[PDB]
Structure formats: structure tokens, C-alpha cells
């Protein structure tokens, strides 16, 4: 009875989505000229990890960047001069995410230890020590992103998300609902809402203040590994293990466009937008990072040069460079 | 060209590079072992024998060889997403209990826990990330298994076994079935040793299997294979 009611309601939502859509985005954007060929040369090569890299995050000053490796190190890099700024030894070697604060005061990290560690960088003593330990997740930490210097949103392998207060140390908000492991999350610029994708092939939009799910986006065939907002905060792209990428609009609440090509059957590790949002960069398991034209659903460029599985990709705040990290222990900067 | 502060930053970067190189060499020497099995296998007991939330790291030194053993049993998350992290592992030690076949989980459909261990071993062994990784298989509770096979026949759980009641024949049949679960014999050796309450007997067998893996890796590095 209840299951039938749920099937009825979701059928009504599907019918509303069908009726609401009138003109395809590809048909409307067909008229505009394609961007062409975008070739990005390597500028800097970063070495010294000696293990596979899992996570990088750009700072808001567009110069420093943090990187997480499987030797138990967080390395904070000066991208212009190639010099290393910080080298933080970690308690747990296994790491799967690392967040760089917007102010730059703190660095978060997490992985298979079920702990989110907050490290202060502006200490008077001059040694980067463990400031905060956020114990309480039941599954592995998959992604974490700072909102301010006191509040952090984390996703975990117990199918939940959490909003934590750093100074108190307790979790202030818990988000439940996903049946599969939440693999990634992305923050909007206003930061009042955040979308997260899980291993149930769906993404959910969560309100930070209220604490409930505002919107639910389905359409993928496999586990969603990556998610990122469009720079206007009204849309977001998802990458999944089914060798496709999708674009979902929050207000439209439907699948705008799908990016895929026949030759590539491997999954999508990470995704990021350009400053204008015209280019969508995504690293795949084919040892390459493809730059897609967002409005034409066609390939605009290829970043080849990594010798192992590309694990992480980030476009900087002013859009002047893109940094890619891979399992070959090298960080590369493209421009 | 570069300012004095920039030169000092370069010197700091060089010192950090030296520290990272030393840490990388020290990590390179360390032998990593991944521990798997069921909850009732006896992981805590065997780890306490060898030594004397989330990931449980055990560090012990045998014959001037460093072993770090990662117990991942605590995590309840889906294994497929985080299994790829453990690709660079020397060996996987998989522990199961021989007395599991009589024990039956409290479910509506009565199922054999031994067959669940068989499915677990088949899933771990046939994983794409672990094709050249050796498996050290440990069979636990040998005395209780001998008493149980004396009291109760093995015909009741699965009918295929028709041999007379004997710990030797039945244990060898379970061992050969576990070896038959392997689908790539050429690129994966399986070391089966019956667990006993002796510190020397176990740790030495683990050291011998790790020694064989190091021999295989050195031969691949030289290029004979």
C-alpha cells in the first residue's frame, strides 16, 4: 500500500518533469559556434610524494595548494615557485580527502580512519599540529569542504553526511537518506545549500540551515564518483562509473545534458568547471583528462601525460591554471 | 635574481625533500600485510599471538623485518569502493574457522556460514586489483574441528563429501576446495596453514610466505620472470 503510494508519487514527479520540459538544451545551444580546439601546455611539475595522490584543493589566493598522499603526508605547495611550503605527517597513512580553508588558516584531511583532522597553519610555535579531531563517523570519510573557519561539511561511508562545529568538536547537523555510500560533495558560492552524490546513482541537494533534502536527482546507471557546482550556483555536473557525465539544473530539476563518447568505457574520477563554466574538465581512468564544451556536448581538448590513473583535478579560483594529480605520484599544472 | 627570502624558501624546500626521501625509504622497507576474514575467525587471538576504530594497525618486527598488518574488519561500508587503496600490498592473510559449518546464522533461510566464507574468499581472490597478490590462508579451531568431525559428520551441511569421519581427510578436502576456489593458479600462490597455539609456528610460516613474495618481486625486478 505504502510502496504503491511511493510508486504513484514518483510517477507523478516523472510526469511533471516530462510535461515541464519543452525544448532541449542541445537544440537551443546548437546555434552558438563551438569553442574549437583548446590546447593546454604543462607549466609546473611537482615531485616528492613517492606514493599515489588522492586529493588536491586550491586555495582562494590561487597560489597555494594542498595535496594528500599515501605515505602519510599532506604537502602544501607554492605553485608559482615549485617550492614546498608545508609537509604535515599524518597519524593514519590511508587518506581519501583533504580540504583547504578559504582563509588558509586550517587544513582538513580524512580517509579510512573514520576521522576528520583539522590542522592549524598559523600557530606561533611554527609546527603544524593536530588542532581538532572530529571522531564520530561510522564509515570511511570520502569528502570534506570548509565553509568557514568554524564549520565543515563531511561525507562518510555510512551513507550519511554531517555538519560539524570545529571549536565545539560535536556534529551540529546530520543528513540521512542515501542508501549508497556518499562519494563526493560540492559547495555552492552562497554556501546555504550543497549537493552530494552517492552509490545509489542519485544526488541530493541539502539545505545547511534547515537540514532536509530539497531536491533529488536520478538518471545515472552506476555509482556517482564526483560532483561539482556550476559557477552561478544554479546547476551542477555529475560524473559516474557508467562512463557518462550529466548536467542537472536546480530550478529545472531535470537532466539538462549528457556528455559521453563511444570509445571511452572507463569511469570518471573527478570533475571541475572553468571560471566561465564554458569548459568542463574531467579526469577519466583512460590516463587522460578530457575538456568538454559544456554548451555543445563535444570534446574540446585532451590532457595526456599522466602514467597512472588520474585521481584528482582542480581549477583554481581565478581560472588561470588547472592542477591534476594521479597515482604516478606527480602533480601537474596545465595552462 | 631570486631574493634572499626566496633562496631561504628553496633551502626549506630542499630540507623538506630530504625528510620526505628518508620517510619514503623507511616506508619502502616496511612490509605491508592486509588482514581479512569473518568476525568469528579469531583475528584478535592470532594478532595477540603474533604481536607477543576503522583501520587497526599492528606493527611487529620479525628477523629484522618490519611487518605492518591492517585489520579492516571494523568497517561496515561497501568493500568495492575502498578496496583499491590496498593494491600495493605484499600479501593478504585471510582467516576462517573450520568449525563454522555447524554454526548457522539466525536467519529465516538457514544458511551455512562456511559457504559464506567460500563466497567471501571467491570475491577477494577474483578481484581485479589482486591478481598477483599472494593469499595466506589460515584455518582456525583445529581441535574443536577434530572433536566436531568425530561427533558429527560433514555430510549434513553439503552432501558432496562422502568420506568417512576423520579430521585429516575432511580438513584436506576443505583445503583442496579452498585451493580450487582460485581461478588464476599461475599468478597467485595460496599458503594454507592450520592455526595452532604456538607463536613460533605461525609467525615463521608468515615470514616464509613473505620471503617467497620478496623472492618473486626481486626476480621480477631483475627480469627473469
Amino acid at each position: 500500500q505504502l510502496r504503491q503510494e511511493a510508486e504513484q508519487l514518483k510517477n507523478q514527479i516523472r510526469d511533471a518533469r516530462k510535461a515541464c520540459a519543452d525544448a532541449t538544451l542541445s537544440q537551443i545551444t546548437n546555434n552558438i559556434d563551438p569553442v574549437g580546439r583548446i590546447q593546454m601546455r604543462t607549466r609546473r611539475t611537482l615531485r616528492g610524494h613517492l606514493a599515489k595522490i588522492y586529493a588536491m584543493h586550491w586555495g582562494t589566493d590561487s597560489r597555494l595548494l594542498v595535496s594528500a598522499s599515501q605515505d602519510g603526508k599532506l604537502i602544501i605547495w607554492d605553485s608559482y615557485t615549485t617550492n614546498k611550503v608545508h609537509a604535515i605527517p599524518l597519524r593514519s597513512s590511508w587518506v581519501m580527502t583533504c580540504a583547504y580553508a578559504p582563509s588558509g588558516n586550517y587544513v582538513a584531511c580524512g580517509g579510512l580512519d573514520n576521522i576528520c583532522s583539522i590542522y592549524n597553519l598559523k600557530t606561533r610555535e611554527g609546527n603544524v599540529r593536530v588542532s581538532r579531531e572530529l571522531a564520530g563517523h561510522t564509515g570511511y570519510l570520502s569528502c570534506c569542504r570548509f565553509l568557514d573557519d568554524n564549520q565543515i561539511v563531511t561525507s562518510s561511508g555510512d551513507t550519511t553526511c554531517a555538519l560539524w562545529d570545529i571549536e565545539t568538536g560535536q556534529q551540529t547537523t546530520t543528513f540521512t537518506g542515501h542508501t549508497g555510500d556518499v562519494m563526493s560533495l560540492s559547495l555552492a558560492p552562497d554556501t546555504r545549500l550543497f549537493v552530494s552524490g552517492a552509490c545509489d546513482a542519485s544526488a541530493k541537494l541539502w539545505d545547511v540551515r534547515e537540514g532536509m533534502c530539497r531536491q533529488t536527482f536520478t538518471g545515472h546507471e552506476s555509482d556517482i564518483n564526483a560532483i561539482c557546482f556550476f559557477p552561478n550556483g544554479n546547476a551542477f555536473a555529475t560524473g559516474s562509473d557508467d562512463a557518462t557525465c550529466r548536467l542537472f539544473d536546480l530550478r529545472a530539476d531535470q537532466e539538462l545534458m549528457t556528455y559521453s563518447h563511444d570509445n571511452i568505457i572507463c569511469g570518471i574520477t573527478s570533475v571541475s568547471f572553468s571560471k566561465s563554466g564554458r569548459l568542463l574538465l574531467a579526469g577519466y581512468d583512460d590516463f587522460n583528462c578530457n575538456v568538454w564544451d559544456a554548451l555543445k556536448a563535444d570534446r574540446a581538448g585532451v590532457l595526456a601525460g599522466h602514467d597512472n590513473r588520474v585521481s584528482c583535478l582542480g581549477v583554481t579560483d581565478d581560472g588561470m591554471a588547472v592542477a591534476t594529480g594521479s597515482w604516478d605520484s606527480f602533480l601537474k599544472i596545465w595552462n | 635574481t631570486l631574493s634572499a627570502e626566496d633562496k631561504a624558501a628553496v633551502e626549506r624546500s630542499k630540507m623538506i625533500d630530504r625528510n620526505l626521501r628518508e620517510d619514503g625509504e623507511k616506508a619502502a622497507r616496511e612490509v605491508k600485510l592486509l588482514l581479512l576474514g569473518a568476525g568469528e575467525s579469531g583475528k584478535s587471538t592470532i594478532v595477540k599471538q603474533m604481536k607477543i576504530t576503522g583501520i587497526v594497525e599492528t606493527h611487529f618486527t620479525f628477523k629484522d623485518l618490519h611487518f605492518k598488518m591492517f585489520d579492516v574488519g571494523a568497517q561496515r561500508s561497501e568493500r568495492k569502493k575502498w578496496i583499491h587503496c590496498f593494491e600495493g600490498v605484499t600479501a593478504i592473510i585471510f582467516c576462517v574457522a573450520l568449525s563454522d559449518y555447524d554454526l548457522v546464522l539466525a536467519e529465516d533461510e538457514e544458511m551455512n556460514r562456511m559457504h559464506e566464507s567460500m563466497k567471501l574468499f571467491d570475491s577477494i581472490c577474483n578481484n581485479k586489483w589482486f591478481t598477483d597478490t599472494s593469499i595466506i590462508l589460515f584455518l582456525n579451531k583445529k581441535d574443536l574441528f577434530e572433536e566436531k568431525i568425530k561427533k558429527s559428520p560433514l555430510t549434513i551441511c553439503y552432501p558432496e563429501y562422502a568420506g568417512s569421519n576423520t579430521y585429516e581427510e575432511a580438513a584436506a578436502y576443505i583445503q583442496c576446495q579452498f585451493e580450487d576456489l582460485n581461478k588464476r593458479k599461475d599468478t597467485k600462490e595460496i599458503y594454507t596453514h592450520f592455526t595452532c597455539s604456538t607463536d613460533t609456528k605461525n609467525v615463521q610460516f608468515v615470514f616464509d610466505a613473505v620471503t617467497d613474495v620478496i623472492i618473486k618481486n626481486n626476480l621480477k625486478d631483475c627480469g627473469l620472470f
Partner: single-chain antibody
Amino acid sequence: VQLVESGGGLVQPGGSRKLSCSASGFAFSSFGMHWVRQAPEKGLEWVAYISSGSGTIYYADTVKGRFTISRDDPKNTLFLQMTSLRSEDTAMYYCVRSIYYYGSSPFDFWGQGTTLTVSASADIVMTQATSSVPVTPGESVSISCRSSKSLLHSNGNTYLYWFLQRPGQSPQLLIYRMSNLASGVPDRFSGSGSGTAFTLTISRLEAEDVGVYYCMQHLEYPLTFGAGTKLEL
């Protein structure tokens, strides 16, 4: 964070003396170290620098060959061996910790000073044009400094540091790289200007700000200080 110096007292000319500075409550091995001298009724003067890990060592030319700096990291101690002292060395010596990376604040923490008495590339010349300005609490005060060489480097940083020495206390850093305020300094101070012409503006003058203000270049060794503008009431 604490630095205390020992080895003071009177010394005969032509003798030898070893000073030692002990550091507590911070990672001594990661900081470079400075010795800075102060004449009794004159400005400050830089003596020497040792990097972290002892990889590079710098000396002033007046003290080149006579003074030997060293550090012991397991005991967290800095040593200065002084041979063949002269009548100009009757000065108070401060130890300074400094860390160098992108965004760092070097010269932030100053020692307490050990007094020693023995008798009772083109050098960038830093020029404090004024010497004393009488001020009243409340008005905004401007202090001018000038250089002999353009301190604007090609990376975009201008290496000018502003220091305040209170009467009878250790000097503190106010401004590093002419724009950023040092950690623990109120927002009353602001630095502005360009190459060869620099200005410190103190809006809403408040008590305990009376002291001597120093402008320092940090473009190339040897470090050369300013004369020192004093304020009074």
C-alpha cells in the same frame, strides 16, 4: 615562545666571550636565527644570521672573521663566540627567530637582550630624515622612510619591515612587507608608499605606542637599518 640570553658582564678589550641563547616553547630547529646589536644611545644594528640546519651563514662586514655563530638543535641553544673584541662592541645584543616561506612573518619575535660593556652589491642606506616628533594622543601621525635602492623586487614584494621599540622593553615587529600587519598588532598602524618613499600612518593614536620606529630593508645581505624616529609626549 621564549628566548633568554646569558653570558653578559664586563669584558676586557682583546679578550674573548661566548654568549648563549636558550629557546623554549617552540620548534627551534625550523627557525633561522639573527643577532642584532644596539648601541646605548643610538639605533639598532644587524650582526649575524644562521639558517635552519646551518646551511647558509651571513655576517656583517664589520664583524666578519671575528665572530662565529653556531647552533645546537637537541639542546635548543644558539651560541656566539666573540674573539678580539673592540671598543665599539659595548652594546646590547638581541636574538631573533625568523621563518621564511610564502606568507611567513619573519622577525616577529625578539629576545630580551644581553648587555656587554668593554669600556665605561651597493650597501642600501636607509635614511630616517626626522629624529623626533612631538605628538598628542588622538591625532594621526605620519613617519617617512627612504631607501638608497628600489626595494620593489620583480616578484612583486617590497621588502620593508616596520619595527617599534618601546622604552625599556624589547622591540616588536609591526609591519612585514609594507602591507601586512604582524600577528598581535592592532589595526591602528598602516604602511603605504612606493619605491624610495615609504610612510607609516598611525590613525587614532593611543597610549603605550610611544617608542622608536625603525624601517628595515630585507632585499639583500647585509641587512641595514634606519636611524630610528622617536615619538614623545
